[PDB]
């Protein structure tokens, strides 16, 4: 249900 928010989080994986 809250799957979209994880997508934006994956970008900050540096």
């Amino acid at each position, epitope marked *: 249900k809250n799957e*979209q928010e994880l997508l*934006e989080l*994956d970008k900050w*994986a540096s």
Partner: antibody, heavy 122, light 110 residues
Framework: QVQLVQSGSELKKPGASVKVSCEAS????????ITWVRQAPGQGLEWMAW????????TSAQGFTGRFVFSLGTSVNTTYLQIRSLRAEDTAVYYC???????????????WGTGSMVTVSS | DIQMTQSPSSVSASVGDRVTITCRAS??????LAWYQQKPGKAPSLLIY???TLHRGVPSRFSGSGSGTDFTLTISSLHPEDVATYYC???????????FGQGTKVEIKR
């Protein structure tokens, strides 16, 4: 009944703009993101961008920024794509799809719209 | 930049044959890869995601394997309804680079 419905085929002059729609049906539009994929006639698929159906910030590949504007409208159950300065290379079928997150870099499209064919000619 | 090298560009095999399609990544993106089927005059549909997981409704002939940069799609027995062009894709988040494979056109020998 879970499908994505897209706008119809369009004819536009070079230098003009086209705005195609994608409406979510059979499911909550704002539960999942929506991504866009392009396919030139006789060519393979080329990913364009995905847009957060809640916030509206798009995430596009290098070649699909600025000239291409992904937006969410007052309507809860539509996202939109706009091409400005339509060029001969933009002639293609533009697919709408629902974006899934199997994990980090495990992104996949489970539901695809029927596509909108855009032809660029005077 | 990154790009997916998909081979063979096309294949012709008889009914019930084993068909293998491979997709090599010029660099490591992730261990996860998705396969898509596009039938003539139709939109693409999801075959496999996560390199091995079948989407619901896809027959079990469709198999997915691989890790790192090398991935393969296996069709146990080439059914007549499997006529289509198949595409692979990996999806990198931080840079927005989701390259597609150039595509493999599957036709049948009868």
């Amino acid at each position: 009944q879970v499908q994505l419905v897209q706008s119809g085929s369009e004819l536009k002059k070079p230098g003009a703009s086209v705005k195609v729609s994608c409406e979510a049906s059979g499911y909550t539009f704002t539960d999942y993101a929506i991504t866009w994929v392009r396919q030139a006639p006789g060519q393979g698929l080329e990913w364009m961008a995905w847009i957060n159906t809640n916030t509206g910030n798009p995430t596009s590949a290098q070649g699909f920024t600025g000239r291409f504007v992904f937006s969410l409208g007052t309507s809860v159950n539509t996202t939109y794509l706009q091409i400005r300065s339509l060029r001969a290379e933009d002639t293609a079928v533009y697919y709408c799809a629902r974006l899934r997150r199997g994990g980090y870099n495990n992104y996949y499209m489970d539901v695809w719209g029927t596509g909108s064919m855009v032809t660029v000619s005077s | 930049d990154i790009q997916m090298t998909q081979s063979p560009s096309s294949v012709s095999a008889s009914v019930g044959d084993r068909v293998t399609i491979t997709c090599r990544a010029s660099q490591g993106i992730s261990n996860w890869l998705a396969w898509y089927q596009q039938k003539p005059g139709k939109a693409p549909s999801l075959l496999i995601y996560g390199t091995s997981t079948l989407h619901r409704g896809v027959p079990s002939r469709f198999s997915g394997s691989g890790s790192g940069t090398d991935f393969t799609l296996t069709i146990s027995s080439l059914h007549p309804e499997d006529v289509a062009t198949y595409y692979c894709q990996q999806t990198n988040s931080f840079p927005p680079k989701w390259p597609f494979g150039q595509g493999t056109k599957v036709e049948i020998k009868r």
